């Protein structure tokens, strides 16, 4: 983006530093999320786990902890992802 206009909410967490430079191969971290909207509350659950696997999803039980509950009240029908290009 190149703008910021008519904002009704902003949140920023504490700054950290993570992998940014270009790498290609087996993935190292699987970060799973659940996004749901209940009565205007946007509930985000997630779990980050180490992996050593490039192929399809590993089989194995893993529970997702809750992390965020955002009161937004927006009628959501579509969504899109954001990809990083080197």
């Amino acid at each position: 983006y190149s703008s910021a206009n008519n904002c009704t909410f902003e949140y920023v967490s504490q700054p950290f530093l993570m992998d940014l430079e270009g790498k290609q191969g087996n993935f190292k971290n699987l970060r799973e999320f659940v996004f749901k909207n209940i009565d205007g509350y946007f509930k985000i659950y997630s779990k980050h786990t180490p992996i050593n696997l490039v192929r399809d999803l590993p089989q194995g039980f893993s529970a997702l902890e809750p992390l965020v509950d955002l009161p937004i009240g927006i009628n959501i029908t579509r969504f899109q992802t954001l990809l990083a290009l080197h």
Binding site: D39, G40, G73, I74, N75
Partner: protein, 50 residues
Amino acid sequence: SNLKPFERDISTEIYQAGSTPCNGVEGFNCYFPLQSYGFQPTNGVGYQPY
């Protein structure tokens, strides 16, 4: 349509009583969803702001 609890309907689409295209026009079956009251200190009890 009606609203779900705690829905904030900010939309300003042109309401149609019957069925006709509307493109921001005020016409027969092309009405606005936005309406207002004119509150004056002399208006009736049921017409005062709360």
